[PDB]
Design an enzyme around this catalytic site. Structure first.
Site, PDB file in Angstrom:
ATOM      1  N   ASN A   1     -23.633  33.427  -8.346  1.00  0.00           N
ATOM      2  CA  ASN A   1     -23.596  33.163  -7.090  1.00  0.00           C
ATOM      3  C   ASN A   1     -23.551  34.826  -5.767  1.00  0.00           C
ATOM      4  OD1 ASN A   1     -24.474  30.582  -7.816  1.00  0.00           O
ATOM      5  ND2 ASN A   1     -22.087  30.627  -8.441  1.00  0.00           N
TER       6      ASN A   1
ATOM      7  N   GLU B   1     -45.291  26.742 -24.693  1.00  0.00           N
ATOM      8  CA  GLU B   1     -45.991  28.535 -25.057  1.00  0.00           C
ATOM      9  C   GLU B   1     -45.023  29.525 -24.818  1.00  0.00           C
ATOM     10  OE1 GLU B   1     -49.749  27.703 -22.686  1.00  0.00           O
ATOM     11  OE2 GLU B   1     -50.459  26.577 -24.615  1.00  0.00           O
TER      12      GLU B   1
ATOM     13  N   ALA C   1     -19.900  22.065 -12.116  1.00  0.00           N
ATOM     14  CA  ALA C   1     -20.808  23.047 -11.584  1.00  0.00           C
ATOM     15  C   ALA C   1     -22.323  22.513 -11.920  1.00  0.00           C
ATOM     16  CB  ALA C   1     -21.157  24.284 -12.718  1.00  0.00           C
TER      17      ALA C   1
HETATM   18  N1  LIG Z   1     -24.045  28.175  -7.533  1.00  0.00           N
HETATM   19  C1  LIG Z   1     -23.205  27.095  -7.884  1.00  0.00           C
HETATM   20  N2  LIG Z   1     -21.760  27.227  -8.421  1.00  0.00           N
HETATM   21  C2  LIG Z   1     -21.005  26.275  -9.088  1.00  0.00           C
HETATM   22  C3  LIG Z   1     -21.012  25.287  -8.151  1.00  0.00           C
HETATM   23  N3  LIG Z   1     -20.240  24.172  -9.153  1.00  0.00           N
HETATM   24  C4  LIG Z   1     -19.341  25.210  -9.604  1.00  0.00           C
HETATM   25  N4  LIG Z   1     -19.736  26.619  -9.822  1.00  0.00           N
HETATM   26  C5  LIG Z   1     -19.526  28.074 -10.064  1.00  0.00           C
HETATM   27  O1  LIG Z   1     -19.048  27.447 -11.006  1.00  0.00           O
HETATM   28  C6  LIG Z   1     -17.744  28.217 -11.671  1.00  0.00           C
HETATM   29  C7  LIG Z   1     -16.776  27.692 -11.939  1.00  0.00           C
HETATM   30  O2  LIG Z   1     -16.500  26.565 -12.957  1.00  0.00           O
HETATM   31  P1  LIG Z   1     -15.831  25.353 -13.246  1.00  0.00           P
HETATM   32  O3  LIG Z   1     -17.152  24.143 -12.439  1.00  0.00           O
HETATM   33  O4  LIG Z   1     -15.220  25.236 -12.306  1.00  0.00           O
HETATM   34  O5  LIG Z   1     -15.689  24.493 -14.445  1.00  0.00           O
HETATM   35  P2  LIG Z   1     -16.239  23.194 -15.507  1.00  0.00           P
HETATM   36  O6  LIG Z   1     -17.238  23.791 -16.596  1.00  0.00           O
HETATM   37  O7  LIG Z   1     -16.847  22.711 -14.818  1.00  0.00           O
HETATM   38  O8  LIG Z   1     -15.447  22.722 -16.253  1.00  0.00           O
HETATM   39  P3  LIG Z   1     -13.837  22.243 -16.241  1.00  0.00           P
HETATM   40  O9  LIG Z   1     -13.089  23.866 -16.118  1.00  0.00           O
HETATM   41  O10 LIG Z   1     -13.380  21.636 -17.466  1.00  0.00           O
HETATM   42  O11 LIG Z   1     -13.650  21.371 -14.256  1.00  0.00           O
HETATM   43  C8  LIG Z   1     -17.660  29.307 -10.520  1.00  0.00           C
HETATM   44  O12 LIG Z   1     -18.473  30.506 -11.174  1.00  0.00           O
HETATM   45  C9  LIG Z   1     -18.544  28.663  -9.336  1.00  0.00           C
HETATM   46  O13 LIG Z   1     -19.068  29.390  -8.989  1.00  0.00           O
HETATM   47  C10 LIG Z   1     -22.488  25.093  -7.404  1.00  0.00           C
HETATM   48  O14 LIG Z   1     -22.818  24.096  -6.870  1.00  0.00           O
HETATM   49  N5  LIG Z   1     -22.314  25.648  -7.500  1.00  0.00           N
HETATM   50 MG   LIG Z   2     -16.080  20.659 -14.414  1.00  0.00          MG
END
Ligand SMILES: Nc1nc2c(ncn2[C@@H]2O[C@H](COP(=O)(O)OP(=O)(O)OP(=O)(O)O)[C@@H](O)[C@H]2O)c(=O)[nH]1
Ligand SMILES: [Mg+2]
Ligand SMILES: CC(=O)O[C@H]1C(=O)[C@@]2(C)[C@H]([C@H](OC(=O)c3ccccc3)[C@]3(O)C[C@H](OC(=O)[C@H](O)[C@@H](NC(=O)c4ccccc4)c4ccccc4)C(C)=C1C3(C)C)[C@]1(OC(C)=O)CO[C@@H]1C[C@@H]2O
Ligand SMILES: Nc1nc2c(ncn2[C@@H]2O[C@H](COP(=O)(O)OP(=O)(O)OP(=O)(O)O)[C@@H](O)[C@H]2O)c(=O)[nH]1
Ligand SMILES: Nc1nc2c(ncn2[C@@H]2O[C@H](COP(=O)(O)OP(=O)(O)O)[C@@H](O)[C@H]2O)c(=O)[nH]1
Ligand SMILES: Nc1nc2c(ncn2[C@@H]2O[C@H](COP(=O)(O)OP(=O)(O)O)[C@@H](O)[C@H]2O)c(=O)[nH]1
Ligand SMILES: [Mg+2]
Lengths: 117, 426, 428, 426, 428
Positions: E195, E243, E11
């Site tokens: 999101n 602050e 993410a």
């Molecule tokens: N807005 C937004 N949300 C994202 C993005 N990539 C992932 N997410 C959100 O992240 C969540 C899923 O988490 P993951 O990215 O699969 O998990 P992680 O924390 O990266 O870790 P792992 O599970 O070990 O791969 C969901 O709520 C997605 O909507 C992004 O580029 N933008």
């Molecule tokens: Mg990840």
């Protein structure tokens, strides 16, 4: 005017559709024929549209009284949160903005603390 | 605001084949589904009738119902079957053989569950429905037999949509089976209950229009339905195309129908002229209302000068002035007010569409509601009372599982329907 | 110092399709918003572009599709372009209650945006019909809500009354009975427009044998431009709308003025023409120029308000007042001795390139309260009582859940409307 | 993150021959092992499936297991056996003759010590392992007989990797031997114990897919496995190819499996259409989820409208927007929440891969977990209780050294497995 | 005068793939490091090239392979490119304890290199999710170690909260219960990003019917660039983040601010646009512009911090404060009478060539502490209690050696979290 064919269009297709739900609905379709009211309201817990109970609300001082299902006996107009209707083309439940509740409203949901765990 | 045209029977699949011939030609579309017109009028209102697929391909939102492939085999092998998807090609084998009890009760119910599943697969794909359209004959065993089972189930599902059919009034000159008045009475017993409205179409009246007014020699079923599709598309496209008086059919259903069981219409086509008087006739608004009032231009064998008009709809097409429309509408009311009901001063609804037809600068469509509709209803009932006594060919329907007191209830409903006109005739 | 025009139904939007074009004629306004000099109907953006203060209401997308795809759409905003999806089916109960309830939550939300944008709101005007589905039902829905929200604003309606001989729908008397009591309850001023009398004006005083709704709205909004846009524009006697509500409506329920206008000159009639002040007011006293099929000779005048344009000399108006008092066939009431209000604007009236009206040096609008209005209501009541006797079309509103007892209740309210003209008509 | 695909039996060696046909075609590789593609997507992820030798030669990391040369003789003499090294060609003589007790207990154990030695020679050559892949049939004597001996020993060796197989559910229409339900019950007695997960694949369900939905005439085993390899490679390449929701199978094994013995999946392939509706159908996200929910597109003969969904995986391929994915995923949950378990609100896992497939702009793969899996489990057990009484052809396995109370324990494990579905159904 | 951005999980890196491109937009920075004039997010080398202060964390190489093989890789250093080899399998326990323990020895060693390179470290910000495996487990592993080592630095998290209706994994409530108590224990300020509310912003205020995670991170980091990069840039009222930690968090455990931003203008919406100071703050009070699916109407405001960009006049801000006090539907608490902090930057906001946002003269960011946040936590707790009743998925952490008693222990900590909004919500 009446909600009863629309409610019969609702639960027979959307909510109580299911082979396991078929003995449950057979106690309900007979109960709707006994009821004298024309305006029928269905109880829901959340926006996931899970069939809780059915009520007999009327816009006049006729009772909210729980017809069939699990729920509270009295629901006040403060207790309502969201108002529901039915789309025959969608076979789902659409959201209504807050307004005076009447016959065109098909179902509702209530407060979370009013539920018991 | 979308319309499904469920076509049933050997008749209605042949009738509506002429209809969507006009619809593809009205919008200038290739027979494979490719748009080649140049108007935004032909571009914006595609959604009402056609489902646009990938690659500018338009799926006609129309359902073909028969218990025999034979009618649909010629349309598919012929032109305009290529625009149709095979999902519109739903049939069984064998047919009912113009039998109502086979199409409605015993064997015809088996295909309807497959048919109404396609209706649900179509209606979920639709964005906004306005009403469902049908076309059959009253003496149609697969047209009206399966159709009364359809409208009974769709009204159960969709109470809010316009439920109309285009049923053909059986002609005494046109006789195929002897149990055709059996089929008509059992239909009206359910068509009044299940439909919102319908039209009154008699081929025998259309036999006069081809020869007396249009001076034609051999009226074929396509040539008859070419005139009907001019009246079928003449009404419903005014819901689609813009105008000063945009006449919804649900607006039309309120204004034309005073009692929910009194929903029978007398269609009429106004610009009727032969090619010899093409160099003789001027096309004006008083010229067409002269032919709208003409009883010879009516699509049902009735005398409107004997009956009395309940309600009148005046569907207009072309660039017309509101002064010439309203003054000519009044002068007919000034002339023939004795053929009107008493308790309504304006029995004529005006409906002007700004969009002109193709070729014609002005065109119009008459829809009337008279008390002379019961005259053809007496033609069915008097033929029914002769047939009901001697029980001729009744053992065919008796083996299907039908009851005679059910037929009397359909006869009583026919006896009620005539007496309802008698309450508002005088 | 601002107000908002409202267009509800197929009738009122087709009026406003011409009227905002007439408002572009007031300053030579380009279709993008560029204009040299005026913010009463407009709001100016940072790019020097002006957007109308217009409310466009129709539950059918088709009329809305006409507006958004034509000219002047660069002026218009999607906030102004409010459309529906399902028809009202020409019904009051669907316009007021059933279909209009899902849109009024947005429509009232849009007005509170625009009223927040206004600085010194004078009020508003609603354009609709009496017998329609949207322009009668949803107008009764909207004016009920605007009177609750904004009580101290101007509530104007310039409404179209269907002819007793010419009606495009049979439910037009069946809608207007329930509409009128709700209309009289909330409106501050309501006009009636009978197109049949407008047809008589076009065929004789303009000699137009083929008019459509486009050419009708040209002549109507030209009067409205002298009513609305002109009273803000400065002249020899600058009078606004807020002084009219006192001086023309002294009644609790009396606010149905007859709007008349009779400089009506065709393109060929301008060659043989020389009209003074008193000569136009004599033509305003003609039954052919009343815009409503009525007989002012058998009606009692409560008031006579005058709106002027262009070449106006007030000394000649005083001679024209004595001219009217000389030519009295008016039956003026005794509750007010000589109350004849005059409004004077110095600016000449405008002429559309493309219309059939000639260019004049002066324009005279006349407002009047007469007792011959109830004869048009007598035509409405006799049609409705025949429909109430046979109980035709009643299932279209009982199917919507309306009461038959409410239907004769509004008839007694329509009877109470005709009692109001009886109390003015009998007493003196 | 590398995967070994050990293929066993006459079935799975024929099944996976269609699989690595796709894998070489997915990366654009010559049948001798030479890369001729042009993408870094086809260049970076070679390590997961192929072992690169000297001279741009790719050794497919897959093991072919049989006790007969005959299946491998056709693949070697045919195409794509030339890319295979001779070390993959490990067999004996003769075969078990579809016998479980010969392949697992008496004769099949002699080759496994040579086979697992090659596994150790391959796993030491690997850089990083992610999971071990298998494919056989439940009625496979050399497929499942040797295979249950494999997974029991590899889980002893490597407990940390994904231990899955692709087993074929035996069809009541497809009958070769009568002791096939004997072989299926003894497999599941160890496959629940030794594997981490598996799929449910029925050829009888695939017979409906080829004819009713795809309109094909003669489904061959290659034509069936061409569809299966679209679902086999449809899942595991999303672990390989990048995306916004990169769905590891070990992430998928956590999200789909609530109870460690309940690890049975319902695969589905979404872009199923014939070539006649190729000019008629639009390829959208609501179009595919319409066919993902379609019970006719399921690879196992079960009724998901009878069962209830435990967990749902939605494997997606193509350039899709996150809004259209999430809203369409919600609407199916709004529609058929009665077919879900109660205690979880989001029973659907989304898996969007950014890398589109070849030819198709959009493709998707359904994976479901319903309670209707026990229905086919009743088909084996009711056939088992009839066969267990009369001891028909039991003396063949009795001479091998098998006990009847061992069979009852496999039956009791089959009785427990159905009852575990009964605990979580209602 | 420097700080480091941290990106943990799939993410946060996809956020930081856009945000450092946004930081190149701040000065027109070339992909090699050449820029004319700014060393806060950067370190300048001897050749005049600048490297980011970015921490890239993912145990999967695939997202790291996207970064190292795309554009701006000349900016990036392999010290910044920290990759793993084995997945966390979307698990909290593997990210925090099992898999993350072999990487954290390197990751903490890399930060101490970069913190040695900084002169006057202000703190850091971590971008992750609540329900992930890497962004929840290893984030709980990392923030535990950073609070021990660097106690007197800023500990920021701009974290993504999964929707109660939209969740990509079933273990996302199963991970976030254990994450949140460890998150609240160590963080100085933590945001929530839903999101689904971002989807409502794109489809209506931008009319984008097809967004992806790329287009989401364009809008998110643009707000963050007004939060992070802008507060060092000088304006009329230069306020830093140090602050904010006093004036927005007066609580021991209260540091969950709602980050809102509502100048949101599409490319076509800019043609009809004139937004003053008070008009934007009215749009910031809209429920559609809250970036989290919540209802601010039924929540009690503790604070209202304001960040401004571009065309700002402070005299008009004082009128805008009286405008907000006029339009009160806010339910502001009584523990602070009128604490409304304002931050003003003179520099205009930036617009990406390639995005769907129009160029605006001013941008307004608003921070708030409301009591409607716990309703989103009430959605999280009811999902977890159903999973704790049926004991589904519990073998994936008992297999990792986690305790079931710790699972309800963090639920009571999640209950104690909702007690904190109860103590603020009831009392006044
Ligand atoms: N807005 C937004 N949300 C994202 C993005 N990539 C992932 N997410 C959100 O992240 C969540 C899923 O988490 P993951 O990215 O699969 O998990 P992680 O924390 O990266 O870790 P792992 O599970 O070990 O791969 C969901 O709520 C997605 O909507 C992004 O580029 N933008
Ligand atoms: Mg990840
Ligand atoms: C040179 C010329 O203009 O020829 C005309 C013509 O002379 C006549 C004979 C036409 C012609 O119609 C017939 O001959 C006919 C025969 C049997 C049944 C129905 C029609 C015409 O076909 C009809 C056609 O009308 C249209 O094109 C309309 O758009 C019509 N469409 C069709 O009829 C149509 C034809 C082929 C394929 C698809 C549609 C329509 C009417 C209502 C609603 C939608 C469409 C026109 C102008 C002509 C011809 C070619 C001769 C007439 O019909 C119409 C509908 O205008 C018959 O009564 C009029 C009198 C006309 O004079
Ligand atoms: N003068 C004039 N009258 C018009 C115009 N459009 C409609 N009308 C009148 O409006 C009346 C018909 O009302 P409708 O417009 O059909 O009804 P509505 O109020 O729009 O509502 P719906 O029936 O729900 O569509 C008749 O009296 C017409 O003469 C127009 O442009 N000019
Ligand atoms: N106008 C017209 N009437 C038809 C046509 N085919 C049949 N009919 C009439 O339809 C009636 C017979 O019913 P039909 O619907 O064809 O039988 P079904 O196949 O059992 O539905 C008779 O009155 C026929 O004259 C046709 O193509 N055109
Ligand atoms: N789809 C498919 N099924 C096969 C194929 N070969 C055998 N089967 C099925 O596999 C089962 C027999 O098991 P099999 O694995 O061939 O026996 P084994 O050689 O002893 O492992 C039966 O259900 C067959 O229908 C094949 O090529 N394709
Ligand atoms: Mg209208």
């Amino acid at each position: 005017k009446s909600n009863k064919p629309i409610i019969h269009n609702a639960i027979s297709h959307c909510c109580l559709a299911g082979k396991v739900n078929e003995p449950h609905k057979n106690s309900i379709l007979e109960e709707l024929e006994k009821c004298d009211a024309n305006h029928y309201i269905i109880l829901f817990r959340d926006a996931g549209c899970q069939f809780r109970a059915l009520y007999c609300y009327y816009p006049d001082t006729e009772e909210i009284y729980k017809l069939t299902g699990t729920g509270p006996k009295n629901i006040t107009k403060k207790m309502i949160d969201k108002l529901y209707k039915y789309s025959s083309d969608r076979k789902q439940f659409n959201l209504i903005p807050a307004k005076t509740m009447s016959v065109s409203v098909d179902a509702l949901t209530i407060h979370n603390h009013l539920w018991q765990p | 605001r979308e319309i499904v045209h469920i076509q049933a029977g050997q008749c209605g699949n042949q009738i509506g084949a002429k209809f969507w011939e006009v619809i593809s030609d009205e919008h200038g579309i290739d027979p494979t589904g490719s748009y080649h017109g140049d108007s935004d009028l032909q571009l914006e209102r595609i959604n009402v009738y056609y489902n646009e697929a990938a690659g500018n391909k338009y799926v006609p939102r129309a359902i073909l119902v028969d218990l025999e492939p034979g009618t649909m085999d010629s349309v598919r092998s012929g032109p305009f079957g290529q625009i149709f998807r095979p999902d519109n090609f739903v049939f069984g084998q064998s047919g009912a053989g113009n039998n109502w009890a086979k199409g409605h009760y015993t064997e015809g119910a088996e295909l309807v569950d497959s048919v109404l599943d396609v209706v649900r697969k179509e209606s979920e794909s639709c964005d906004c429905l306005q009403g469902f359209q049908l076309t059959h004959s009253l003496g149609g065993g697969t047209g009206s037999g399966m159709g009364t089972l359809l409208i009974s189930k769709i009204r159960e599902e969709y109470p809010d949509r316009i439920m109309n059919t285009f049923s053909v009034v059986p002609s005494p000159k046109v006789s195929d089976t002897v149990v055709e008045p059996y089929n008509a009475t059992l239909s009206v017993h359910q068509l009044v209950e299940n439909t919102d409205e319908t039209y009154c179409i008699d081929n025998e009246a259309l036999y006069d229009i081809c020869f007396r007014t249009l001076k034609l020699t051999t009226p074929t079923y396509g040539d008859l339905n070419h005139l009907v599709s001019a009246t079928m598309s003449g009404v419903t496209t005014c819901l689609r195309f813009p105008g000063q008086l945009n006449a919804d059919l649900r607006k039309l259903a309120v204004n034309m129908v005073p009692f929910p069981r009194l929903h029978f219409f007398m269609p009429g086509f106004a610009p009727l002229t032969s090619r010899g008087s093409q160099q003789y006739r001027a096309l004006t608004v008083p010229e067409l209302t002269q032919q709208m009032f003409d009883a010879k231009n009516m699509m049902a064998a009735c005398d409107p000068r004997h009956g009395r008009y309940l309600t009148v709809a005046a569907v207009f097409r072309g660039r017309m002035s509101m002064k010439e429309v309203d003054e000519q509408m009044l002068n007919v009311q000034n002339k023939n007010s004795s053929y009107f009901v008493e308790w309504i001063p304006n029995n004529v609804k005006t409906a002007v569409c700004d969009i002109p037809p193709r070729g014609l600068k002005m065109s119009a469509t008459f829809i009337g509601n008279s008390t002379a509709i019961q005259e053809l209803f007496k033609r069915i009932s008097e033929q029914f009372t002769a047939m009901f006594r001697r029980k001729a060919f009744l053992h065919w329907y008796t083996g299907e599982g039908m009851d005679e007191m059910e037929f009397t209830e359909a006869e009583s409903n026919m006896n009620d329907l005539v007496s309802e006109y008698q309450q508002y005739q005088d | 110092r601002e107000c908002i025009s409202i267009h509800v139904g197929q009738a009122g939007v087709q009026i406003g399709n011409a009227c905002w074009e007439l408002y572009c004629l007031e300053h030579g306004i380009q279709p993008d918003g560029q204009m040299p000099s005026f913010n009463t109907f407009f709001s100016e953006t940072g790019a020097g572009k002006h957007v109308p203060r217009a409310v466009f209401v129709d539950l059918e997308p088709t009329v809305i599709d006409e507006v958004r795809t034509g000219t002047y759409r660069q002026l218009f905003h999607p906030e102004q372009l409010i459309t529906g999806k399902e028809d009202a089916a020409n019904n009051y109960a669907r316009g007021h209650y059933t279909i209009g309830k899902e849109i009024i939550d947005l429509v009232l939300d849009r007005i509170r945006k625009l009223a927040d944008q206004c600085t010194g709101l004078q009020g508003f005007s609603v354009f609709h019909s009496f017998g329609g589905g949207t322009g009668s039902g949803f107008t009764s829905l909207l004016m009920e809500r605007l009177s609750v929200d904004y009580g101290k604003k101007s509530k104007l309606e310039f409404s179209i009354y269907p002819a007793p001989q010419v009606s495009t729908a049979v439910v037009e008397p069946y809608n207007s009975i329930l509409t009128t009591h709700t209309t009289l309850e909330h409106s501050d001023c309501a006009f009636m427009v009978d197109n049949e009398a407008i047809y008589d004006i076009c065929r004789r005083n303009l000699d137009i044998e083929r008019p459509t709704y486009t050419n009708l709205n040209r002549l109507i909004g030209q009067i409205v431009s002298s009513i609305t846009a002109s009273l803000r524009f400065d002249g020899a006697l600058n009078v606004d709308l807020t002084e009219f509500q006192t001086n023309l409506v002294p009644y609790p329920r009396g606010h149905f003025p007859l709007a008349t206008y009779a400089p009506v000159i065709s393109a060929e009639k301008a060659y043989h023409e020389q009209l003074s002040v008193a000569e136009i007011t004599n033509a305003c006293f003609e039954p052919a120029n009343q815009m409503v099929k009525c007989d002012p000779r058998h009606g009692k005048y409560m008031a006579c308000c005058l709106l002027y344009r262009g070449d106006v000399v007030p000394k000649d108006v005083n001679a024209a007042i004595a001219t009217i008092k000389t030519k009295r066939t008016i039956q003026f009431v005794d509750w007010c001795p000589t109350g004849f209000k005059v409004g004077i604007n110095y600016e000449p009236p405008t002429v559309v390139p493309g219309g059939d009206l000639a260019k004049v040096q002066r324009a005279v609008c006349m407002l009047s309260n007469t007792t011959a209005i109830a004869e048009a209501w007598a035509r409405l009541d006799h049609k409705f009582d025949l429909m109430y006797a046979k109980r035709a079309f009643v299932h279209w509103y009982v199917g919507e859940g309306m009461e038959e007892g409410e239907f004769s209740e509004a008839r007694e309210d329509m009877a109470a409307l005709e009692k109001d003209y009886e109390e003015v008509g009998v007493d003196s």
